[PDB]
Amino acid sequence: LRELKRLKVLRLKSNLSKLPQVVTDVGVHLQKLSINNEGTKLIVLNSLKKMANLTELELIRCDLERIPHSIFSLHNLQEIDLKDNNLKTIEEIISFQHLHRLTCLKLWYNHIAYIPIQIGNLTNLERLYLNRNKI
Amino acid sequence: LRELKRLKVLRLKSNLSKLPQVVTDVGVHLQKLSINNEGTKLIVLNSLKKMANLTELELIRCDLERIPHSIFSLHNLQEIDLKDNNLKTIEEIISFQHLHRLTCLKLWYNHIAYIPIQIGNLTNLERLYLNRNKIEKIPTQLFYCRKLRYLDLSHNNLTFLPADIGLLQNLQNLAITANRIETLPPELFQCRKLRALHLGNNVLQSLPSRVGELTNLTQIELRGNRLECLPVELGECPLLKRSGLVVEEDLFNTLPPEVKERLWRADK
Amino acid sequence: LRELKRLKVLRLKSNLSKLPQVVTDVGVHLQKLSINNEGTKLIVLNSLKKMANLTELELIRCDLERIPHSIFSLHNLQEIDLKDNNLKTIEEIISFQHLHRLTCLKLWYNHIAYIPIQIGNLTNLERLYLNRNKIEKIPTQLFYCRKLRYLDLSHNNLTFLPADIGLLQNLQNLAITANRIETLPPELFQCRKLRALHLGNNVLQSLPSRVGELTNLTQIELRGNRLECLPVELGECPLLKRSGLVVEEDLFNTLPPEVKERLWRADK
């Protein structure tokens, strides 16, 4: 994968235990990464900090169980999708306030019981999807 | 050929040493003659003077090296194309002042160093192409041609655009591509009728806010610049669409989401 | 041919050096004769005087080079067609004033430079076609022909329309296509009976409000202009429909939504 130096989009639906090192090595020019892990637990291992060029991230069906803090360094993010992570509390959004272009948050099909109050500091939001939850 | 009594257009691409006598004999009714000689020298021999009905003449790649003076008797000419004749000075255009329907002059890929001043007396011009030449300055007299719609000055050695560009009240589209212009004069926006402005692949450092005033803008080039963001006022253009705002995507992303939504609506 | 004693129409397209004697001998009962000689010179010679019953004459592509004077004795003529005779001056029309039923004169595709003034004495004219010629101006005397319904002056060298055009009270259709007219005189809308106006592919910058006065207008061309929007007063034409509003689509979009709604209902 190191030889494909102009790739802007990689999507993998491969039941992956971890994110490949080689993907994050190729992350210099990648713009959107999408992993559909089908409920298999994905390990991020801080490599994700290199993807400063990332504007849209989808970590789908990865049984993450925690919003990774590495997101907070990715100051260009516009969209996040967290399909199927059994999320009940989303307090970590307090630190999303520094992601100035974040306009679309997609947290469907989780076990969220309430919306934390700090959401009001996410003043740039244009799309918010919390459907199919326990609010 | 004499029996083909209704021929209104003849074009020949035949490596000709001279203009055939039979052509000028048939010139009673011919309206357009076009010769592409591919650099082979054409001899005219004054026979061309008989073609009183001619309205468009193209003597293409004939290595003429100077505009002949027989052309001035062709009082019906509307368009001239002088591709690839190594033209350096075009002062003779003063005698074109009597061609009242001359709207299009095509002089690309020559060695022209400057624009003669008498261009201001060609008041009926609508199209002027002087791109791909060696031009150093723009005379202000060009702007007496207030009915111009198309002006192409791309690929010259222009540094700035004079304020007198505000005088083209009938300008609609304009290309000054691939020069080293740093910023646009304000007077450019006196041309209210603009619909397209091709300025990409220059060294622009900033795009003025007054782009918001171009109501009828649908196409604009800004690509190939070291910009970090775009000005919000691009959203103020009513007839513009996402496909029409031709700019790098990372720069495009800087616009408000509302503008991008209106662009989404506009397309479908 | 002598045996066919009831023939009313003979047309010949046969590259004829002369008009046959036998045709003129059979001319007792013939009503319309048409010769298409394909540019071959036709010799009349004094026989044509017998065709007193002729009401319509077409001497087509006959390289005549002169209006034959024998026409002046043919007092029943209603229509004349002189396709392709390289005519530059038509002064002979002064004597057509005695042809009282002449309503249609067809002189296209010639080299006519001007209209002689005596045309005003052709007071019974209802159709006049001088299109595809070299005419530079309109004499006012043309407008004494107050029975004109159709006038075609497309593809000439006209710059303006005289105000005296208001005198054609019976005018219904009119084409001035492919000139360089910038604006229409208001007096043009004194011709109340207009139903179609083909003005496309000109350099018009504005369309006058007085188009509202054309009650019976159903078709009008505006294409090929530098408009940015369209004037609302076209909506003041009662019988106009979307199919009759002949204009570029981008310009059509500029009209008020109400006008487009009325056009939607009007069609179906």
Curated annotation (Swiss-Prot), chain A:
Cellular compartments annotated: Cell membrane; Lysosome membrane
Tissue/organ expression: Expressed in brain, kidney, ovary, lung, liver, heart, and fetal brain and liver. Found at high levels in bone marrow; lower levels are detected in peripheral blood cells. Expressed on T-cells as well as on B-lineage cells.
Chain positions of LRR repeats: 4-26, 28-50, 51-74, 76-98, 100-122
Modification note: N-glycosylated.
UniProt comment concerning the protein's domains: The volume-regulated anion channel (VRAC) channel forms a trimer of dimers, with symmetry mismatch between the pore-forming domain and the cytosolic LRR repeats, a topology similar to gap junction proteins.
Free-text function comment from the UniProt entry: Essential component of the volume-regulated anion channel (VRAC, also named VSOAC channel), an anion channel required to maintain a constant cell volume in response to extracellular or intracellular osmotic changes. The VRAC channel conducts iodide better than chloride and can also conduct organic osmolytes like taurine. Mediates efflux of amino acids, such as aspartate and glutamate, in response to osmotic stress. LRRC8A and LRRC8D are required for the uptake of the drug cisplatin.
Subunit text: Heterohexamer; oligomerizes with other LRRC8 proteins (LRRC8B, LRRC8C, LRRC8D and/or LRRC8E) to form a heterohexamer. Can form homohexamers in vitro, but these have lower conductance than heterohexamers. In vivo, the subunit composition may depend primarily on expression levels, and heterooligomeric channels containing various proportions of the different LRRC8 proteins may coexist. Interact with GRB2. Interacts with NOX4; this interaction prevents the ubiquitin-mediated degradation of LRRC8A.
Disorder cited: Agammaglobulinemia 5, autosomal dominant: A primary immunodeficiency characterized by profoundly low or absent serum antibodies and low or absent circulating B-cells due to an early block of B-cell development. Affected individuals develop severe infections in the first years of life.
Family designation: Belongs to the LRRC8 family.
Entry protein name: Volume-regulated anion channel subunit LRRC8A
Source organism: Homo sapiens
Upper classification of the organism: Eukaryota, Metazoa, Chordata, Craniata, Vertebrata
